[PDB]
Design a protein around this ligand. Structure first.
Ligand code: AUL
Ligand code: MG
Ligand code: MG
Length: 540
DNA sequence: GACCACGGCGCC
DNA sequence: AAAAGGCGCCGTGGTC
């Protein structure tokens, strides 16, 4: 439709661009175009043409900014219709779906993508006028956050390649030891990686008691929780659990990550997806760096490979009990507020009860266990499941869940309020007004409806915590630039920064204060901060 | 070579 | 597996 005009485009034009592959740090910029005032400008040479733009405005603006940054160009992202659509409805996660929904078609041609970006932005902006709170989130959080994320993606993180390659060789030998024992115990070999073949071995051949079924196909489950119940019915069970631990870590981290070092940066680059979750959280992919191991000894060894540039240090900051503090604010429970105004720690107190140990002797691994419990219970875990994990009678898990909510009355009151509100309006919302539509609150199948309810009332809590962290990132990023430091990773309620050694301590204190005072609530926000040469050492 | 569905599991 | 929620990636099985 647009009249074809010559490159370059006027100021403020919307851009379209086509990449050889989805990851901006690895992509070849195949084509570039821009659209404005009923015209389309198609770049004759896309790389040269990047220099003429002052701002990336259009669909997937951040990705093109990351590519520009990779090429030494400071091209910040600006308006992006995906961010408008994601705020209207977080099920809007792909350019495919957004275009089809708001007036166009995501093609594989840059000129058409540019014209699409223009008309989608006009329509979606029209949808938001009136929606003042979503507008506030777009202007003060999401749009400036996209610029922050582009810098994080282009910066990357340093990885100790030789260390991981050495680790691979050791873990391989240990894996072979375990699988050979498994085959001996089974009486023959098979593909231990195939849960279907393992199902037959355990349940048909060895005649072990089947405990659970899989969700979609109703096969007898071999999940870790099921194997946990059988750890004593037969020795092969334990060997399998250790086998899965090692092969999971080897196949997902040890072996893949070394091959992803970028040739020009010498670092590892993730993508921080900004329109990917139903609650407002970010995600991470290609590779995912929000699920790097930390729990087990081997996992810790892997986390140590994430290191600071020489002359620099990592600074890791992690909000304390974040979603519990958010819950205190959203619900207004007087007793839970006092917990945090008194400085108490629920994860430690639960850990104390769980293991029958005073608070002082609760180790870090014990506190991690208590977090699964505390958040399992809060978001609707059953006594059956809780009794099964804690290895205690059903009646004990029954009671724990009982005491839990009795201690904090207004929580269930807030849950029921949120649900009724969601049933009527069709969506639930965070503190800042980020919405999630949950129509299955009115499903007539009980299991479906109650799952919807657990989704529904989780989202204001998880989501508010996400809004806080996003806002803190937007406030902190310019302060770090000032001190010559870098923002590297976000892990939902944690930030990993890189700072020159001489300024690492000043960076830690500043980032701590920015995170704690981002947006005061009815309770204090506390942040744990550590500094070290590797990701593991940088957490306390 | 690539798609999906699935089970499974790493992290928050 | 289970009346916890939210992600992305692995190998398998089965295609295409
Ligand atoms: O690693 C483990 C298991 C430990 C081993 C226990 C098994 C023993 C078996 C018996 C053998 O004899 N568990 C994982 C612990 C980490 C889980 C985190 C988590 C977080 N969130 C949400 C809620 C939380 O507020 C936020 C941030 O996560 P976080 O930072 O880890 O937790 P939080 O901020 O609340 O606590 P701290 O930061 O530690 O103060 O993310 C959840 O909704 N569910 C979870 O399971
Ligand atoms: Mg935390
Ligand atoms: Mg954390």
């Amino acid at each position: 439709a647009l009249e074809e005009a010559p490159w370059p485009p006027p100021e403020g034009a919307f851009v379209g661009f086509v990449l050889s592959r989805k990851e901006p740090m690895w992509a070849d910029l195949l084509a570039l175009a821009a659209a404005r005032g009923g015209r389309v400008h198609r770049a004759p040479e896309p790389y040269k043409a990047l220099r003429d733009l002052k701002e990336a405005r259009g669909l997937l603006a951040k990705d093109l900014s990351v590519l520009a940054l990779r090429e030494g160009l400071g091209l910040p992202p600006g308006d992006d219709p995906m961010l408008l659509a994601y705020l209207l409805d977080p099920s809007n996660t792909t350019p495919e779906g957004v275009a089809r929904r708001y007036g166009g078609e995501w093609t594989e041609e840059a000129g058409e993508r540019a014209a699409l970006s223009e008309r989608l932005f006009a329509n979606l902006w029209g949808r938001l006028e009136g929606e003042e709170r979503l507008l506030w989130l777009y202007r003060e959080v999401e749009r400036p956050l996209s610029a922050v994320l582009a810098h994080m993606e282009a910066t990357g993180v340093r990885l100790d390649v030789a260390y991981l390659r050495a680790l691979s060789l050791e873990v391989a030998e240990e894996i072979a030891r375990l699988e050979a024992e498994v085959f001996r115990l089974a009486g023959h070999p098979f593909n231990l990686n195939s849960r279907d073949q393992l199902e037959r071995v355990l349940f048909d051949e060895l005649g072990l008691p089947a405990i659970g079924k899989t969700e979609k196909t109703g096969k007898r489950s071999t999940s870790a929780a099921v194997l946990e119940a059988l750890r004593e019915a037969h020795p092969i069970v334990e060997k399998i659990l250790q086998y899965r631990e090692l092969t999971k870590l080897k196949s997902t981290y040890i072996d893949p990550l070394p091959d992803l070092i970028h040739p020009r940066t010498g670092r590892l680059h993730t993508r921080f997806n900004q329109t990917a979750t139903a609650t407002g959280r970010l995600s991470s992919s290609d590779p995912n760096l929000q699920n790097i191991p930390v729990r087990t000894p081997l996992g810790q060894r892997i986390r140590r490979a994430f290191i600071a540039e020489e002359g620099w240090l990592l600074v890791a900051l992690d909000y304390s009990q974040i979603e519990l503090r958010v819950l205190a604010h959203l619900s207004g429970d007087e007793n839970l507020i006092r917990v945090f105004q008194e400085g108490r720690d629920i994860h430690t107190e639960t850990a104390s009860w769980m293991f029958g140990v005073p608070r002082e002797a609760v180790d870090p691994l014990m506190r991690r266990a208590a977090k699964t419990i505390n958040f399992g219970v809060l978001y609707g875990m059953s006594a059956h499941r809780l009794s099964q994990e804690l290895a205690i009678p059903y009646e004990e898990a029954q009671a724990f869940i009982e005491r839990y909510f009795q201690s904090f009355p207004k929580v269930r009151a807030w849950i029921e309020k949120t649900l009724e509100e969601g049933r009527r309006r069709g969506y639930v919302e965070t503190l800042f007004g980020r919405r999630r539509y949950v129509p299955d609150l009115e499903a007539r199948v009980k299991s479906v409806r109650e799952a919807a309810e657990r989704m529904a009332f989780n989202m204001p809590v998880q989501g508010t915590a996400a809004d806080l962290m996003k806002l803190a990132m937007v406030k902190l990023f310019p302060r770090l630039e000032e001190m010559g430091a870098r923002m590297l990773l976000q892990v939902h309620d944690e930030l990993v920064l890189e700072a020159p050694k001489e300024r690492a301590e000043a960076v830690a204190r500043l980032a701590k204060e920015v995170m704690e005072g981002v947006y005061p609530l009815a309770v204090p926000l506390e942040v744990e901060v550590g500094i070290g040469e590797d990701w593991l050492s940088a957490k306390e």
